[PDB]
Write an enzyme that holds these catalytic residues in place. Structure first.
Site, PDB file in Angstrom:
ATOM      1  CE  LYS A 209      22.661  49.561  59.139  1.00 10.40           C
ATOM      2  NZ  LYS A 209      22.824  50.682  60.094  1.00 10.40           N
ATOM      3  NE  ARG A 243      25.175  49.172  66.765  1.00  6.13           N
ATOM      4  CZ  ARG A 243      25.338  48.328  65.755  1.00  6.13           C
ATOM      5  NH1 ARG A 243      25.466  48.793  64.521  1.00  6.13           N
ATOM      6  NH2 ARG A 243      25.373  47.023  65.982  1.00  6.13           N
TER       7      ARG A 243
HETATM    8  C1  LIG Z   1      21.594  44.883  61.720  1.00  5.21           C
HETATM    9  C2  LIG Z   1      22.817  45.595  62.192  1.00  5.21           C
HETATM   10  C3  LIG Z   1      23.862  44.591  62.557  1.00  5.21           C
HETATM   11  C4  LIG Z   1      25.095  45.304  62.988  1.00  5.21           C
HETATM   12  O1  LIG Z   1      25.555  46.259  62.293  1.00  5.21           O
HETATM   13  O2  LIG Z   1      25.538  45.073  64.141  1.00  5.21           O
HETATM   14  C5  LIG Z   1      22.463  46.472  63.352  1.00  5.21           C
HETATM   15  N1  LIG Z   1      22.248  45.976  64.548  1.00  5.21           N
HETATM   16  N2  LIG Z   1      21.879  46.795  65.576  1.00  5.21           N
HETATM   17  C6  LIG Z   1      21.699  48.215  65.442  1.00  5.21           C
HETATM   18  N3  LIG Z   1      21.326  48.889  66.573  1.00  5.21           N
HETATM   19  C7  LIG Z   1      21.112  50.271  66.535  1.00  5.21           C
HETATM   20  N4  LIG Z   1      20.709  50.959  67.708  1.00  5.21           N
HETATM   21  N5  LIG Z   1      21.311  50.972  65.273  1.00  5.21           N
HETATM   22  C8  LIG Z   1      21.690  50.247  64.136  1.00  5.21           C
HETATM   23  O3  LIG Z   1      21.837  50.900  62.934  1.00  5.21           O
HETATM   24  C9  LIG Z   1      21.887  48.819  64.236  1.00  5.21           C
HETATM   25  C10 LIG Z   1      22.292  47.933  63.116  1.00  5.21           C
HETATM   26  O4  LIG Z   1      22.560  48.441  61.866  1.00  5.21           O
END
Ligand SMILES: C[C@H](CC(=O)O)c1n[nH]c2nc(N)[nH]c(=O)c2c1=O
Ligand SMILES: C[C@H](CC(=O)O)c1n[nH]c2nc(N)[nH]c(=O)c2c1=O
Lengths: 263, 263
Positions: A209, A243
């Site tokens: 990030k 994640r």
């Molecule tokens: C916006 C960004 C996009 C990516 O990194 O895939 C993104 N999508 N979905 C996400 N979904 C969850 N549960 N936690 C997250 O921090 C997160 C993301 O940072």
């Protein structure tokens, strides 16, 4: 610590034995509306690789609802067939979530915490899948970052439980990198353990990030060590999932943390 | 938090602004007793590289006292000239420590905590350099690992203060990987924050150690992610230095931790 297992249809995830790794799946074909061999094959190969590197979950996911479905459904269908790991659909749209689960997704992953389309919570309740409610908002005008986050998260729990979602199907996410200044993202990381009082498993999403780049002054591809730090801190502070893009690496760091904290 | 700076002769190290990185310097020439161009040049080049990667200190160090000196003194002499960073001599022998400091070393780093040669403490007091007292012992028959470690460490503080060592010249090290089973090394990591009550800066030395290999089941060259985890946990738990091989990487993780914990 957790007196239940995360039930994911054919798969079950134990919340106590280890930090669970969610791998982030890759890229559309320029000449198709979805389903093409190149893009779906790339997806399956990435899912397989992440499976091999220690991923426990495969996360799959501005365009329209129709396009979003045409694109993501073929991927869920192949990956679910060819990769024996639970799948989460990265959407905040009720109809996308429905289609994906029909297609084979096991978990819903909603970056708007059921506040963009409350009906997604109903889809969740209906199909009886776990749902990830991430903290989000359209502004960053806080009076007490953690206090506000916890209130916000809690507003999502209410929408979810009002819809029929069982407590055991709820997971929380602090929404790092969302509606937060760099200094605010650091503050959230610093006080992450407060999310625990709400009594639900927490998933952390910090991989590569921008706030890491802001600290280290490094571009996205140079953020493995920073991602690592955030993952380590996150596990120390009690999170149940991380994640990540770099599954091999992060899986290794997590496993080491687990051993040290006794998990 | 620290109301003093670590005074290292020409260099000063602030204990509050950031986690301090100690880089571990490399390899003898097969046909010399020391001082040779190949080995000393390799050493200087490694010191320089570590300097470039974010090291704050260069750590330099069964053979005899005479050989040990013939080998290490030329290295200290070149590195101190050509690399503007404080140097620590990795020895537990009084006479080696004396020679090294004369040669240009700024800090003493004793893996036996002044218990192998109490006279080293006198050398320390005499030259007024900081000394690192690591926890060690010839057995692993504990009754309360942390309690015992703290008693042991404290026995070293006494030898040191009895010799004239000022409190501000004392640093502690939990001696991970020493006289400890793998499970014991993990337990020490888990309760590291207890060392803090003794009131002295703590240095952590876990880099690529065998207990990481025991957790991850990976060889020494495959231990960057595990080392990383231990470094992260160590900083969270309040340590002031980490002693590492992988300076680039570990420096990055540390810097990220610092930002998150607010240091
Ligand atoms: C916006 C960004 C996009 C990516 O990194 O895939 C993104 N999508 N979905 C996400 N979904 C969850 N549960 N936690 C997250 O921090 C997160 C993301 O940072
Ligand atoms: C034995 C090993 C050798 C090496 O890694 O250089 C070694 N030497 N000196 C050391 N000195 C300190 N203060 N802390 C340590 O953990 C440590 C070591 O692990």
């Amino acid at each position: 610590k957790w007196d239940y297992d995360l039930r994911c249809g054919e798969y079950t995830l134990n919340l106590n034995e280890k930090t669970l790794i969610m791998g982030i799946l890759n890229t559309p074909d320029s000449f198709s509306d979805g389903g093409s061999y190149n893009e779906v094959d790339a997806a399956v190969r990435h899912a397989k690789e992440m499976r091999d590197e220690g991923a426990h979950i495969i996360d799959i996911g501005k365009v329209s609802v129709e396009e979003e479905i045409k694109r993501v459904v073929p991927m869920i269908q192949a990956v679910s067939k060819e990769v024996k790991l639970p799948i989460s659909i990265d959407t905040y749209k009720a109809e996308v979530a429905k289609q994906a689960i029909e297609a084979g997704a096991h978990i819903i992953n909603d970056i708007w915490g059921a506040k963009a389309e409350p009906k997604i919570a109903e889809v969740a309740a209906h199909y009886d899948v776990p749902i990830i409610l991430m903290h989000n908002r359209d502004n960053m005008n806080y009076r007490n970052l953690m206090a506000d986050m916890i209130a916000d998260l809690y507003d999502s729990i209410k929408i979810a439980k009002d819809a029929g979602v069982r407590d055991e199907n709820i997971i929380l996410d602090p929404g790092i990198g969302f509606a937060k200044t760099p200094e605010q993202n650091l503050e959230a990381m610093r006080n992450l353990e407060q999310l625990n009082v709400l009594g639900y498993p927490v998933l952390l999403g910090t991989s590569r990030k921008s706030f890491i780049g802001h600290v280290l002054d490094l571009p996205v591809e140079e953020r493995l060590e920073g991602t690592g730090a955030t993952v380590c801190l996150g596990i120390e502070k009690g999170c149940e999932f991380v994640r990540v893009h770099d599954v091999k690496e992060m899986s290794r760091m997590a496993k080491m943390m687990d051993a040290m904290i006794g998990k």
